């Protein structure tokens, strides 16, 4: 739906995509009430293989434990052993949760939520039907005994207690940084307010080559740069010298749409261009300001950036908004 | 001179100090508790600053808008609203010269350097 809206936006227009949006907002509701999607105690269908995934875990640990008592592995070693054991156990049970639905219960009220863009999350659904993993001790370590039960069944006295430890840390990680929302945006705004796109074009021809290959995943192994990164380093920008690739010629000083980047990645998969020449604020001429060709697209839409936009403020804010999510 | 472009800041000579001044506060007088009118050529006098009233003067020879840019023959009262009061400066002629502490007390001595 998101991608559909994005495409219909730059195809049908803005004022139209509004109406499409509200149509979806209408129909989707009206149907979501007819569907009868509800949440019952049974709805959170526990996977069938639970007892076995635990059994094969238990009958595993019983052996490993002995190896310690005999004196084979060290303390650290078995600590990491139990770790691998339950780390794999929970992940495996998760698959049983997500598969039991898809096979026997295609239209599970708890499944359709987590699946589509609605509320829900993989490892979260894992907690309702399957079991919670090993929780965190007050320190950086982990309890060697994981919460072997689910929220649907009775989560025992002591288990809740050992989950509380990380549970309270969560609050700090979010609530201690609800206040830091004004801090980064502030610091960045101070150095940026002077920047605004008040030019048509500059007299310079300096660019940068945004690389299409990440050199540093393993030791030194060159490979395709992430599907996401490339898009945000090339979308709505301006070249500095024409470059033909897959069979179509990209104009000189052209406002690349997303598809431009798409076919570029496709061409780079075959062994064509390693980099792309591009104008950027990094190399403008305008003392206080940045020109039109240098900035690029974004104007709450996919249009050439208007002459006179308050860009510095906008950029600062867009770096600031998701600061607290770290 | 209709379009304000840029602003400069610089020290001011005695001349330019007095240039914005429209008279000397030669008394430490504010306001009488009885007559809320200004006192003895001090801080609120209409002669140096502006008319405490709107378009009307001190005594009342001239009272309305018809004679907008005129000063009375017997007492000097040229009148816009209570704005001319709030936009005109007065000054004080010190006996012995005194230095601006701003240029004295600083991390770098603007005068001791």
């Amino acid at each position: 739906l998101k991608d559909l809206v994005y495409q219909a936006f730059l195809r049908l227009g803005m004022e139209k995509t509004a109406r499409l949006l509200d149509a979806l907002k209408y129909y989707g509701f009206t149907f979501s009430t007819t569907s009868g999607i509800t949440i019952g105690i049974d709805d959170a269908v526990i996977p069938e293989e639970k007892k076995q995934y635990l059994e094969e875990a238990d009958r595993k640990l019983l052996q490993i434990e002995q190896a310690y008592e005999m004196g084979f592995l060290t303390d650290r070693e078995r600590y990491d052993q139990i770790l691998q054991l339950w780390t794999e156990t929970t992940e495996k049970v998760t698959q049983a949760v997500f598969k039991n639905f898809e096979e026997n219960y295609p239209f599970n009220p708890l499944y359709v939520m987590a699946q589509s863009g609605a509320r829900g999350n993989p490892q979260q659904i894992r907690q309702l039907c399957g079991l919670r993993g090993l929780m965190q001790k007050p320190s950086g370590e982990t309890f060697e005994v994981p919460v072997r039960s689910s929220f649907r069944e009775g989560l025992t006295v002591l288990e809740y207690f050992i989950s509380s430890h990380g549970a309270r840390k969560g609050g700090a990680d979010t609530a201690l940084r609800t206040a830091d929302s004004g801090y980064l945006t502030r610091k960045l705004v101070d150095v940026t307010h002077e920047i605004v796109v008040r030019e048509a074009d500059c007299g310079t021809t300096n660019y940068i080559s945004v690389p299409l290959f990440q050199p540093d995943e393993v030791t030194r192994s060159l490979r395709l740069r992430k599907r996401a990164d490339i898009e945000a380093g090339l979308y709505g920008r301006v070249l500095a010298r024409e470059v033909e690739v897959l069979g179509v010629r990209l104009e000189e000083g052209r406002y690349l749409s997303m598809d431009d980047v798409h076919l570029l990645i496709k061409a780079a998969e075959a062994g064509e261009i390693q980099e792309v020449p591009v104008r950027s604020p990094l190399t403008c001429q305008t003392r206080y300001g940045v020109c039109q060709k240098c900035y690029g697209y974004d104007l709450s839409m996919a249009r050439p950036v208007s002459i006179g936009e308050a860009v510095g403020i906008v950029a600062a804010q867009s770096i600031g908004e998701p600061g607290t999510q770290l | 001179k209709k379009e304000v472009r840029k602003v400069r800041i610089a020290l001011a000579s005695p001349e330019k100090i007095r240039s914005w001044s429209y008279g000397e506060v030669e008394k430490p007088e504010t306001i009488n508790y009885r007559t809320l009118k200004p006192e003895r050529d001090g801080l609120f006098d209409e002669r140096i600053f502006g008319p405490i009233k709107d378009y009307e003067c001190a005594c009342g020879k001239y009272k309305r808008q018809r004679f907008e840019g005129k000063v009375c023959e017997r007492c000097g009262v040229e009148v816009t609203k209570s704005i001319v009061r709030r936009y005109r400066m007065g000054h004080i002629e010190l006996a012995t010269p005194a230095a601006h502490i701003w240029f004295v007390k600083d991390v770098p001595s603007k005068i001791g350097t």
Partner: protein, 93 residues
Amino acid sequence: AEPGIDKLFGMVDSKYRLTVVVAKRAQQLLRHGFKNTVLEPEERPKMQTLEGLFDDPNAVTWAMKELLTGRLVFGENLVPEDRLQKEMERLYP
């Protein structure tokens, strides 16, 4: 959405140009009588109680639906400053 805004945003160089145009149009349209409108016979914005938007409810609506037609022309320097103001109060009440 608003009356065909994609035609508008494209009708100019910068998106803000449009805002200033629409604005000043509304201004001179309200100040010098609501009669210097360029599409008042049949193709004209209207309201719901009676049909009395023909007079003066909104100033901006009229500007936006005005520029939609090739009746006016914007620009940097078109008319001498003072003259415009004077003759715009002469030709209308």
